[PDB]
Amino acid sequence: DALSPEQLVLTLLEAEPPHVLISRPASMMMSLTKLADKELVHMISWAKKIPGFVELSLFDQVRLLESCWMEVLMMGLMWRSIDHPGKLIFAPDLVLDRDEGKCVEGILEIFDMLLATTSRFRELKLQHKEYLCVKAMILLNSSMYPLVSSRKLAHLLNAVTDALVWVIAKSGISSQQQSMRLANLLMLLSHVRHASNKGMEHLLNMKVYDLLLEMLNAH
Amino acid sequence: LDALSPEQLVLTLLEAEPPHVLISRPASMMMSLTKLADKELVHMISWAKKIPGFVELSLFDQVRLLESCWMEVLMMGLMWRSIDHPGKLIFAPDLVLDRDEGKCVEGILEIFDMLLATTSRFRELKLQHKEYLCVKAMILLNSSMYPLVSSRKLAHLLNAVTDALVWVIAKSGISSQQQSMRLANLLMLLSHVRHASNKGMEHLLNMKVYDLLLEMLNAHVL
Ligand SMILES: COCc1cc(O)cc2c1O[C@@H](c1ccc(O)cc1)[C@H]1CC(F)(F)C[C@@H]21
Numbered sequence: 031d032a033l034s035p036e037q038l039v040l041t042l043l044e045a046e047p048p049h050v051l052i053s054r055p056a057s058m059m060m061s062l063t064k065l066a067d068k069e070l071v072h073m074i075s076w077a078k079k080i081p082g083f084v085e086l087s088l089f090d091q092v093r094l095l096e097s098c099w100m101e102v103l104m105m106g107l108m109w110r111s112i113d114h115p116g117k118l119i120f121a122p123d124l125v126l127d128r129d130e131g132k133c134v135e136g137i138l139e140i141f142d143m144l145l146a147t148t149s150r151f152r153e154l155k156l157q158h159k160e161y162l163c164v165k166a167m168i169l170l171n172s173s174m175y176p177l178v179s180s181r182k183l184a185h186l187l188n189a190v191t192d193a194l195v196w197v198i199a200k201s202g203i204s205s206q207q208q209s210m211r212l213a214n215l216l217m218l219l220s221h222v223r224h225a226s227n228k229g230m231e232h233l234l235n236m237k238v239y240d241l242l243l244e245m246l247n248a249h
Numbered sequence: 250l251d252a253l254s255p256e257q258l259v260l261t262l263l264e265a266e267p268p269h270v271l272i273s274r275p276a277s278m279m280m281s282l283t284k285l286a287d288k289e290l291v292h293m294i295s296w297a298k299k300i301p302g303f304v305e306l307s308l309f310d311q312v313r314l315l316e317s318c319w320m321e322v323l324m325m326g327l328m329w330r331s332i333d334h335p336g337k338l339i340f341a342p343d344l345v346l347d348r349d350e351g352k353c354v355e356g357i358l359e360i361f362d363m364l365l366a367t368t369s370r371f372r373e374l375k376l377q378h379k380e381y382l383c384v385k386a387m388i389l390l391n392s393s394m395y396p397l398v399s400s401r402k403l404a405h406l407l408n409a410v411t412d413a414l415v416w417v418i419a420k421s422g423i424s425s426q427q428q429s430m431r432l433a434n435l436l437m438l439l440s441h442v443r444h445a446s447n448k449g450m451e452h453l454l455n456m457k458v459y460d461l462l463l464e465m466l467n468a469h470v471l
């Protein structure tokens with residue numbers, strides 16, 4: 031019942047992570063990193079509150095959480111940035127506009143993906159409900175392996191899909207449009223995956239992940 | 250309008266399918282794969298040019314899409330011909346590799362395991378020959394965001410192929426909840442193809458095709 035469309039969205043709403051203040055006393059990169067580390071703590075809490083997540087094997091939970099974290103941080107960036115073109119509201123005291131991304135090399139490229147991708151969610155007029163579901167789906171779909179308890183993950187993923195389908199339906203739009211809007215939302219996930227990979231490759235070319243693994247062993 | 254109709258579209262995409270590519274071999278594994286990709290890229294341009302309306306986008310957008318997608322489209326094609334043989338990757342008619350052979354070159358084993366995992370997830374869903382044709386089209390049309398944010402034309406094209414996929418799934422005869430689930434299941438896979446595409450690109454750029462593609466793209470432009 032807790033996975034029923036209306037209940038599942040309300041459950042996902044309450045599970046939303048709190049505002050994260052980095053509290054600043056290389057640096058842009060220090061701030062971004064200090065934030066990710068803080069956000070990852072709350073992301074674990076969040077996933078635990080998704081009905082049925084905790085009941086997957088700890089193997090799968092860790093597996094999903096290790097491969098999605100970047101996407102899920104990005105999806106959350108996009109969503110709070112959605113109403114302000116040219117900017118990226120990372121946190122309540124860390125708003126960066128595109129050009130501030132020229133400082134650090136390779137980052138301007140990524141900012142432009144996030145901004146482009148945000149722009150597209152603004153064009154589709156992404157709804158608060160739809161976003162709640164999409165984010166859940168990013169986590170549940172983040173790794174293929176734990177799917178090829180697998181029974182359980184498949185059923186969970188279908189659950190959130192149905193909820194998204196349900197959300198779109200009470201939109202009152204025709205059935206052709208319902209399918210199109212489902213398809214348009216899901217194709218954007220390819221682009222969030224994309225920006226996630228760019229940020230990861232870049233993150234590793236730098237001179238959080240270990241801190242995450244610590245949290246994961248703690249989990 | 251009508252040439253983009255669900256039925257005509259799928260048949261058109263069918264005929265547009267690239268020919269078999271014989272690599273014809275007289276570091277080496279990576280030499281083969283690279284010579285193959287280069288050959289495949291030629292035919293991929295032809296293939297896109299046969300997708301109704303592709304040619305009637307601005308040249309700028311055609312080039313944007315082709316440069317962004319070529320790896321995913323090549324991988325999508327790999328997965329599809331490999332789909333019935335677990336543990337293997339039929340790259341071409343004279344280049345079948347199995348998981349283990351991926352240990353030779355470093356970094357490649359990780360990629361093979363994504364490709365093989367993704368292929369298994371398409372074998373479990375029982376991907377249909379026409380579902381595949383539509384999906385591949387969508388990978389190209391969805392490969393770049395920028396040309397969408399002629400943009401009118403790309404959106405229309407992208408809706409067309411989607412409708413075709415929905416249509417294909419519909420005559421599947423399954424219920425409506427299942428039709429949605431299967432649309433959703435196919436599309437979430439695209440994230441994983443994107444993903445493997447990115448790992449291959451990164452790995453390719455670390456090595457000592459892309460320039461040869463830009464040459465092809467300039468010739469497509471002239
Ligand atoms: C702690 O990780 C820091 C970091 C290092 C890096 O090399 C790349 C990235 C990094 O942070 C990522 C990030 C995304 C969302 C969010 O809420 C917090 C952090 C993105 C931000 C970025 F600048 F767009 C690139 C990518």
Ligand SMILES: COCc1cc(O)cc2c1O[C@@H](c1ccc(O)cc1)[C@H]1CC(F)(F)C[C@@H]21
Pocket residue numbers: 279282283284285286287289323324326327340357360361364449450451452453454456458
């Ligand atoms: C010409 O590019 C050669 C290459 C270099 C590299 O660094 C990485 C890759 C490469 O080839 C890619 C490829 C994918 C499909 C296809 O039909 C032909 C080639 C994949 C094959 C791979 F080995 F799985 C990794 C990735």
